[PDB]
Symmetry: D2
Subunit: 480 residues, 4 copies
Amino acid sequence: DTMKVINDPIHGHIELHPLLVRIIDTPQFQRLRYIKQLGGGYYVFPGASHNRFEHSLGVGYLAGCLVHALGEKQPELQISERDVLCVQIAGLCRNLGHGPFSHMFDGRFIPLARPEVKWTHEQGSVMMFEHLINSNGIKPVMEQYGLIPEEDICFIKEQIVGPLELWPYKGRPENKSFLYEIVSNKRNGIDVDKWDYFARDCHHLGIQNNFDYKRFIKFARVCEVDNELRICARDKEVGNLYDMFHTRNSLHRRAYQHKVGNIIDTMITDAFLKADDYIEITGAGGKKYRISTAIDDMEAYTKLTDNIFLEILYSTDPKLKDAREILKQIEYRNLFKYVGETQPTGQIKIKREDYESLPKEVASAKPKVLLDVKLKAEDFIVDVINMDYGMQEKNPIDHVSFYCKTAPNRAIRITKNQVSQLLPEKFAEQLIRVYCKKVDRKSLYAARQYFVQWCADRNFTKPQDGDVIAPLITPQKKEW
Amino acid sequence: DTMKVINDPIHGHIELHPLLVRIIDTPQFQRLRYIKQLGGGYYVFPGASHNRFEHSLGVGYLAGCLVHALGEKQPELQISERDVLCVQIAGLCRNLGHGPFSHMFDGRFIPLARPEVKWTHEQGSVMMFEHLINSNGIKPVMEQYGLIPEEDICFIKEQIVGPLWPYKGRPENKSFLYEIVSNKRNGIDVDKWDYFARDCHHLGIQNNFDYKRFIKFARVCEVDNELRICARDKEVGNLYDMFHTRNSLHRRAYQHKVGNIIDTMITDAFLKADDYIEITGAGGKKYRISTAIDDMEAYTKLTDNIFLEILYSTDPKLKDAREILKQIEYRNLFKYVGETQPTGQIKIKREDYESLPKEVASAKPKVLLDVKLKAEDFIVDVINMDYGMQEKNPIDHVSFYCKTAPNRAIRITKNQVSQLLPEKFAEQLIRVYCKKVDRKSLYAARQYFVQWCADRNFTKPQDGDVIAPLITPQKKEW
Amino acid sequence: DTMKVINDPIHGHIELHPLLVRIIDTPQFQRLRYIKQLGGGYYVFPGASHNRFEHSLGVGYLAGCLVHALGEKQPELQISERDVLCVQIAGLCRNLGHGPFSHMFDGRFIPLARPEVKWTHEQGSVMMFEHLINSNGIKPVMEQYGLIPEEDICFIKEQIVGPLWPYKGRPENKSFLYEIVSNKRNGIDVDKWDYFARDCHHLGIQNNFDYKRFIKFARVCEVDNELRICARDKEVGNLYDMFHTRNSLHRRAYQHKVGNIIDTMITDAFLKADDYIEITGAGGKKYRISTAIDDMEAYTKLTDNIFLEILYSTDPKLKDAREILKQIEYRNLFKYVGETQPTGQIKIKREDYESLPKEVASAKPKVLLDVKLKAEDFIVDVINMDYGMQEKNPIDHVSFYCKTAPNRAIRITKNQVSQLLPEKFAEQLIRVYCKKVDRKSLYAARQYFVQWCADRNFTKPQDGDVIAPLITPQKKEW
Amino acid sequence: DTMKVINDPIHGHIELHPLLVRIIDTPQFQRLRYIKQLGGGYYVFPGASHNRFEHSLGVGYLAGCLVHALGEKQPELQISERDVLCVQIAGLCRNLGHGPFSHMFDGRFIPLARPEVKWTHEQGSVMMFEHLINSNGIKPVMEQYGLIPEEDICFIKEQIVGPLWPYKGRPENKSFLYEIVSNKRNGIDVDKWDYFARDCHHLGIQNNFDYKRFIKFARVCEVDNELRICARDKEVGNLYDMFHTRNSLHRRAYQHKVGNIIDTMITDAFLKADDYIEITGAGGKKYRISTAIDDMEAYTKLTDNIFLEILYSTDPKLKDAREILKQIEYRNLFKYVGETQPTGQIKIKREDYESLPKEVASAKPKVLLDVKLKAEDFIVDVINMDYGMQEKNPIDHVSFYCKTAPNRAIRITKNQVSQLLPEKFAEQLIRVYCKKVDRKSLYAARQYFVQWCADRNFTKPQDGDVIAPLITPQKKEW
Ligand SMILES: Nc1ncnc2c1ncn2[C@H]1C[C@H](O)[C@@H](COP(=O)(O)OP(=O)(O)OP(=O)(O)O)O1
Ligand SMILES: Nc1ncnc2c1ncn2[C@H]1C[C@H](O)[C@@H](COP(=O)(O)OP(=O)(O)OP(=O)(O)O)O1
Ligand SMILES: Nc1ncnc2c1ncn2[C@H]1C[C@H](O)[C@@H](COP(=O)(O)OP(=O)(O)OP(=O)(O)O)O1
Ligand SMILES: Nc1ncnc2c1ncn2[C@H]1C[C@H](O)[C@@H](COP(=O)(O)OP(=O)(O)OP(=O)(O)O)O1
Ligand code: NA
Ligand code: NA
Ligand code: NA
Ligand code: NA
Ligand code: NA
Ligand code: NA
Ligand code: NA
Ligand code: NA
Ligand code: NA
Ligand code: NA
Ligand code: NA
Ligand code: NA
Ligand code: NA
Ligand code: NA
């Protein structure tokens, strides 16, 4: 077994070490071929047919490019061949825990189906990796290539999920601290997983990427920052890092939080909720699990993919009728209808515990307009979206270290005022989208009146088309 | 009316007329989201995750670009808005009849499972379109936009599948319209243009054909008393390059030796599953994977999903099918032994395919072997590579015009273009694989293979001297 | 004569009407082949070899795309063939007035060589267009294609340079036409769209603005009793991104610290050569590099070639000029010391520029230095970065329409889009360089520089702590 | 001094070792910024503004990629850091000897102006490199980085121009290194790889050769007791495609019929200017355009600028030269009459070129002509199109390895790959143009042309029946 070459449209011809090949050629990894990267986004951007499989190869490749580049420029770090493989494997395997339609599954479905548990795709990746290792005899193969399974497995899992609970990591000592910033960077969010999905999502969506990850890799260095070795960027690149998070935000606005993409993810979630009692997935020992409990058994979870959508759509059982009809509505494009978008003003934040009550508030509004129909709470969906630069209210560039041309081993900080006055003043905000489940012309007219009146009552921002969709409501609000 | 815009990575922002949107928003069209364009190719080229859905939008768009371009340059053709919509709809709908894994289903599975029937994806598209029309109340919507369903449905179906003037959907003065979506005269059509661009974007191989350039130089002229789409004389080199590119894409990607063996293993799994999977069709009647083609309501539910239904099954009756698919996941694939071609005049006929594994196993290589292999251990895959018209040069069926007389159609022969062009336009490739994957079986398989090539006067395999050093010295030609 | 087709790597195959071809095939237009789009940027980004000629073809093409798109969607605007040609011509001709190294010539050279005059490339374009028309017998060719030279020439010139309705080339009901080539209201025009795509292709930085998407959503609506080009409401995010991209391109490429210092050195060489180079104009009268702008026949011969005329000269009078250009070839450039910005209300006005090198040399660092530097050893470059309208948000001057009422124009404020947008739309950068390149001079230059930043309450330079560790602790702030 | 990074749109961010930087920052290298890669091609493809400078950086970078790749995969070859630098330097410097408009200068101008000498851009590069080294003190800088100037300079020059082992710069065990920059065995080298990608990016024609794939599969193996670079067996298809692409680029772009006639007109202007332009060289001695090749200090100043020096001149002695250049700006070009090829064994040798205009004018068409044309009215351009090795298949000079024995070199014949490949590897194109551009002259020129083709048994011109309907019936073949 020798180096395989694989041709990827984003990165070109990528070399895979035979241990990587052994990890890839398992049911646990190959599963990612059946999970769309962008979930319901495929129903809006028809190029976005790519799956988590190819994204994962790309993350593994880029993780290897960055660690190899640091090792060649700085031999004094003592990056070993073993370190390189562990970083590549962690890159490959950080997407293993994703579920059907990717963010739909851990962002919408699981929190509604199992409100008592705290599940992330990260934790799932660690569990799925363990199952991959143990079911496929990977440990003897790791030893053959010089890995020490005990320590290296721990290292790999820590790169995915952070400390498995003073230097908190066990897989590598503090002098290799920089290695924990490559695959999943908890300090500031700058990591190779974003770099792959920027390039890959853009190629498939038909929106062009402005971030240059190769340029970043070339200027990257390891320096001592508060007695820990960290990956630092060249001072000059600070503009480009602000542009990188600006790009992330553009991709969320244009594509990932597309108003129709989100409502399709919501409809799929609702179909999976109604189907949950009746779909059975066989796991370890022949025990049966549901869509919502497959996360408790990795053998069941292995078989939980986008296929669930089609199993529901093609079913004939009367018990799956409600689930199936929601999916049929997607095919006919009879979707829940977008009413509009607003934001809170001032320092007002809408917290997760208030979400359920928002459809009630929209239906409780009293627009002074003659209406043919009256709508209820259950007729409205309210979707609250938190947009930020990856670290809630914080500027992630405040957590980046830099070096200068004249002293490349000396780490420095650069503040927002030292770069530009044209940068954002805040780093987080909320969007509120409202939709109506009643699609007829009179219901939709009514829904707009309730919506705009609610925006006025709550002192939210004037919807962009407020004057067109509710001309009788927007004059009562002086500031509009 | 109300145009939708859709953003496609190949063509940019595409406008869809509301009638097209009505056709697209049906179970019969949306089904194409679950059929991979390149089938088992995704298992070799990981970027090739694209489905028939997006390819079909692109063919519809390009069909519209070509017909609009001809109408603007030549008002005298009388291309109406109705013609434009019919051509776009036929473009949209020519892929409706594809099955699971696209060419796998009509190229491998159906010919083995139903050898007596003559099924093509084209005929399937016509049948699926009829079912799409009748199940979704499309005829009143056609009338709303000025189409005449009787004539226009006939036109649309004829553009997909073909037929004194033999067509009924349009008269002879619109003969050129039949050359846009599916060109029976020479193979130059908008379906190829979309898949060249789209497959290349996804495979990571760069496309060298410029379809926009071609559309700009295209004109309709009278050729033997029939109006045809002609190309500019100067463009003749680019058309030879276009078929050269098609041939490269087949060699590099579509007939990739591992892509084909994965399609073969999936076919074998579907054969072993065929008795046991049921698909519900019209009136609750049950169909199999091999009979779903006889009922469009069943066939609607026949997609790549079948692969996962088999892979995830627990039924003991699906065990053999499921194990073949598990072999694909572990990459325990049937092993490639090699490739050869016939020499001289020799062509291998379709009726002799079944007997070829027997001939390879019957060869007597003078090498000491620890295993003996049988007929069933060999797969022999014969691939016909051509320029789309068997042995014919398709450029002999293209008409050209000159700058100084743009309504005068001419012919250009291969001799008038270049001496560096192909001398033949068709050939066969013979790939041999072994179902026994261990190192000793594979060694043995190579000896039988090379010996068979020697016995049959086939070409010396490229690695012949390395894989069978004891066999290749007997053959003086090599 | 009929349509020429030209293949451009940015836009593909572009069609040129024969009148445009006649305008392009003149010495006044073909001159733009010898003026680099990005001037000294080519000396930093080696892909940036592109010239104004191809950019101008692209602007003419995109001007035609937008006016055609508006006309097809809204026949009621009565856009005539004549309007289309005049808009395409204005698009083609808006770069005619550029000088050697593009922005170097009107941004640095002319203001220093002729401080008393107010010259812009725009005014130059109008004058060069008039000369192009009259020297090449274009007026009878305009008449042949239905143009009325009196009104249409006026229209074309007004589209490039601007002026109760103040325009004479078209009445108020065609007011939207003045927003295509050079948009005075908000800066959204086709010239930006071409240079975004073209500069990005050549620089190796990828463009994220989608101009085609913008064209598809564009409509003309009534706004305060005047017809204007409006954008779809949803696209407002993309317009903010468009100016954000313009700003990124300025930071990364157009105001690159070494690109600018190369433009400065070339400017200095042209100043020292100005007394001695002669350019023959109309009548045989002689002009200088700085006076060629007063005679279009001389200016026709004033291109990047002047750089090489100086570099290859042997005349002893051009020695000092030639030596500066030789320093560029050896890469012995004036050295970058650093960058800072003003804080608070502080704005640095154009009348204070000359005094800044004096202030840096007057600073008293409080560290012992081996050499002392003077005013002439420093260059101080002030760069104004904005969104095209000084302190104003250009999106406040954009009109929008909604899906439910496409003829009804609306306004959208910054708070209705996002909290993550910029709070200001203008700022200044100050770069300092040193003409003395040795290690001791450069160390000293950094101490003066950082101390000056401290004295003036400017921002702490990014590398302040590394380049001047003894100076940055004295500032209660840093 | 450490690595510079340079951003190139084709290769991305490229690292330059400080010795390379020292070679690049000289007047001898920087001169390549003023020589267009494609010469007159820019006058047809407006994207083709790129210069030899950036192409050279790219060849240097790719030379380094291939030698690094071989060294990492095969440590037993003992590729040193010194070898890597010498290979990068040879890559950087192989284009130094190009003249104004690249192939125009050594392909057209020099053969006509200096018929007694045998000059190539290769020999020019060696001479320019020597001058670069000696004028800029590069030898001590080479020693600083471990190079041995005597041996390594010889190595570098041998990699550019060529020579029982005939080379002195490296012994036989490093023989593979001579195949990277300029491969005399088969033409597969990094210079092609860069211009495929770069010319395609600028021309707007898409490249289908994947050089990175090739580098990944490349290995060094023993072939007839010499170490050589071998390709993987199954890449053989791709190598045939690589030369097919080279040929397509020649047909579409580099031998464009208008590109070539513009190169011819520029050559004619330079011939008429040759007596009157002076270029100052070493010791103040004066040279002409045609003698600047004999003094590297003069040749340093000989660039595309010469075109504009002629165009902008006022000297009455340069009038005829200047008028030809003015005709290019107005697009009053010599007119294309047509294209033919020889049939049979007939090859047209360089000594018969001068007589061809005479033969066309001597033909006796037998139709009534209003004007009669003479020899000097015709230009006949003979173009040799091949796969880089005259009549030979360059793939017969490629060595391959198989997966099962990667140190064992093999040969692969054309019949082992495909029957759809070219049957010949060389041909000639004959283009005829007319210097008289009026309608009557052009009609006459076509009659003479077609009659000449008939008399000589050349191929029927593609538009023969349209341009000469009365002449093409006499010829039974046609
Ligand atoms: N000619 C080609 N150009 C571009 N990519 C290719 C081409 N041929 C194959 N690929 C892609 C498909 C895969 O992603 C990757 C490797 O394919 P390939 O080299 O065919 O390996 P293989 O594993 O089938 O052969 P082998 O095992 O004999 O080396 O390159
Ligand atoms: N900013 C963007 N840039 C590029 N593509 C986009 C952007 N926004 C959306 N898309 C894509 C997704 C779709 O394929 C296509 C149409 O999207 P969009 O204009 O959002 O339609 P819509 O149907 O959601 O809006 P509406 O119905 O309100 O007009 O363009
Ligand atoms: N095969 C090609 N592919 C892409 N671009 C090409 C090709 N051939 C030429 N071009 C480019 C060069 C020009 O920019 C544009 C038009 O050139 P071309 O069609 O050769 O026109 P022409 O003016 O030389 O021919 P004619 O006058 O006979 O129509 O296309
Ligand atoms: N932000 C950017 N994105 C892409 N390319 C850039 C960017 N900045 C500069 N370039 C280009 C121009 C050059 O070709 C190459 C290197 O430029 P740059 O990093 O600016 O070097 P420099 O020599 O000016 O800086 P220094 O000497 O301070 O390291 O990259
Ligand atoms: Na797709
Ligand atoms: Na990590
Ligand atoms: Na530093
Ligand atoms: Na058809
Ligand atoms: Na082509
Ligand atoms: Na073929
Ligand atoms: Na296949
Ligand atoms: Na597999
Ligand atoms: Na052939
Ligand atoms: Na709207
Ligand atoms: Na260009
Ligand atoms: Na070179
Ligand atoms: Na060179
Ligand atoms: Na060998």
